[PDB]
């Protein structure tokens, strides 16, 4: 009945866990999940950017 | 001395076939130059793409 405070609350792959291209983090926040843009080979603009999932 | 008038017509022709052509070696150049302009244009893409990607 409660979201997981994070990946670890859920028990799942943390911020620096599951990743690859254009993904330099993947994170949960009280069930709100978020991942970050890479810091290169990107749009110089969006370089290293996120958006949550709630 | 219509001969003069003649030689006049000669004379004015005399100094008429010399230095009465500006800038055409100048002009051909532009296109001759501009020909060179025509080519590297396509390179701009991957250049952009490289900038675009990266």
The CA radius of gyration of chain B, in Å to the nearest whole number, is: 26
The values of phi and psi at residue B20, to 5°, are -100, 30
Exposure string over B14-30, b if 16+ CB within 10 A, otherwise e: eeeeeeeeeeeeeeeee
Other residues' Cβ atoms within 10 Å of the Cβ of residue A33: 19
Resolution in A: 6.0
Token pair listed for A40:
């290169």
- Asked if A10 is an interface residue toward chain B (Cβ–Cβ < 8 A), one would say no
Q: Computed from CA positions of residues A38, A39, A41, A42, in that sequence, does the dihedral angle turn out positive or negative?
A: positive
The residue among A11, A41, A10, A7 whose CA lies nearest residue A23 is A41
Which residues of chain A lie closer than 8 angstroms to B51, CB-CB? 44
> How far B43 CA lies from chain A's nearest CA (Å)?
19
- The dihedral sign for the CA sequence B6, B8, B12, B14: positive
């Amino acid at each position: 009945g409660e979201w997981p405070g994070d990946n670890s609350s859920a028990g799942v792959a943390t911020s620096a866990d599951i990743k690859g291209k254009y993904v330099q983090s993947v994170t949960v926040a009280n069930g709100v999940i978020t991942a970050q843009m890479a810091s290169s080979n990107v749009n110089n603009e969006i370089k290293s950017k996120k958006l949550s999932l709630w | 001395f219509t001969l003069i008038e003649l030689m006049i017509v000669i004379a004015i022709v005399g100094i008429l076939a010399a230095v009465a052509l500006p800038a055409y070696q100048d002009y051909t150049a532009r296109a001759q130059v501009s020909e060179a302009i025509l080519l590297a244009e396509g390179q701009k893409s991957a250049v952009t793409e490289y900038y675009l990607n990266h």
